Symmetry: C3
Subunit: 213 residues, 3 copies
């Protein structure tokens, strides 16, 4: 049975949507496949679209995943690790601002370690993207929530920028931040990408997606 969204694209599924794939050890899982972007075959593990879901959540919630198939979600750190663990695949970040303006940014490999390793971000080459690089900064850094401080700052970046990310001191990207809708006076606590629209602009749409090498 189908193991990646790439497989499903290969089996003639051309419309984006939720399909079940089979995890290394046989667990059925409905993932969102993006069959459209950049050749198609992407498995989406994060999406922000309308601010209907609260992303300011604790460790246990990020671990198992949350949100809605109808709109916004986070697939879950366990699932994300399961998907990008054995073998390797690439990350694609997509961003649309409120004027209908598209930008992206691909890297050539992406993986997160398991819970014992605090979901460490393993990130390689920024290939290209109109949105620029604002994610390598966070390379080799442990995942943080508001109730598990594993960050580089002396104070809690997750709580400060209202999100859950691979926080150092602190961040150039904050895609799990608050849905602030465009420009905001508050500093760096929205759906922000430094090299893209900056620390005071919150995107309308964000998607993080992977595809096998």
């Amino acid at each position: 049975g189908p193991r990646t969204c790439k497989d499903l694209l290969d089996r003639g599924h051309f419309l984006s949507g939720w399909h079940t794939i089979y995890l290394p050890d046989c667990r059925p899982l409905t993932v969102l496949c993006d069959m459209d972007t950049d050749g198609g075959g992407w498995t989406v593990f994060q999406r922000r679209v309308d601010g209907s879901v609260d992303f300011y959540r604790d460790w246990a919630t990020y671990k198992q995943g949350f949100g809605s198939r109808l709109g916004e979600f986070w697939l879950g750190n366990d699932n994300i690790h399961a998907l990008t663990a054995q073998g390797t695949s690439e990350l694609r970040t997509d961003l649309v601002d409120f004027e209908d303006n598209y930008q992206f940014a691909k890297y050539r490999s992406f993986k997160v370690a398991d819970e014992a390793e605090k979901y460490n971000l393993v990130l390689g080459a920024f290939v290209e993207g109109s949105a620029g690089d604002s994610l390598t900064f966070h390379n080799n850094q442990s995942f943080s929530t508001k109730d598990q401080d594993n960050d580089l700052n002396t104070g809690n970046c997750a709580v400060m920028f209202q999100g859950a990310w691979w926080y150092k001191n602190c961040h150039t990207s904050n895609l799990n931040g608050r849905y602030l809708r465009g420009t905001h006076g508050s500093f760096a606590n929205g759906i922000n990408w430094k090299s893209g629209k900056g620390y005071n602009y919150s995107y309308k749409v964000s998607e993080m997606k992977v595809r096998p090498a």
Copy 2:
């Protein structure tokens, strides 16, 4: 197969489905129904039977349409009175109503029990006690009243509440909530004909999002 399966969205949550979305359950009588499960709110496991989000669907509809259900899995819908009765007839389901205004304020109401009688009793609302909620109690008023639509006036008003207030609801004489009213988008001059909740944002403010959902005790 209609044994094996999940009977409520609560069952599906317990079976490790963590993302909200459309799943098929089996009603007390094995009939399989595809429902929207809210796995996120207040512990998760809610079956959503009403959803207003963007005004794309007309809720000003006749009796037959409310009976079988209408709208879209992609956006707004009413599950259908038959289904709603089937879902709530045996047992106690708590009810929760979730509301969001256009300035991003979120409000809710919660009730100990909720059930609607069958068609012969005109989908009579049987409402348990108000338990808590920022939105305030604007449903207790409608306890023990028949459902009404534009073409079937079962209210306690000499007029037709469903025509005056452009919805369908368990109107009394006439209302304190009108969640199936017109999608008027925020404050409106017209009186009480929007997606209104009296103790919430009053008779002149129509919310951006409303959801009604149920879950086993």
Copy 3:
């Protein structure tokens, strides 16, 4: 075995949405059923809603289908042919403008031939709707894309009006054109329907759908 969205309606599915049906050839297809409009039971094969999907696409892409179950899509010419081949189905076209005024056109029968015949369009007589008739003009003409010009123009109409359609010389409807959002100065390159809002108005919503005659 449900063969059409009409079948699903008769079996008591009253909410519009994506359901899987079985084609005359037995392939299972997941389609958008419109259970609401004009008695319900329509299978939607084209949907424009917000301009999120690029419809300016090549032959291979139109053949297999593209877009998203969450928003805009084209079911795919192969699928459309498979759904229209045997018997005959009605066609309804629904159009919404930016003040939410709805229009429609309705045709007794509609079918597209297969790839060998270039998905040639076989349309029956105009029945009533208020949008007027802007498809009859296109009867008996192959489908053209930017990369497969089958029109009756010395140029490439798909390139001239940036869509893909049964172009003659050139068109009176262009529902796969650019999502230009209301009135546009450019000529006839939007989601246009001549007898509806003319060559300089691009609709907000467009849907093409079929149902057993």
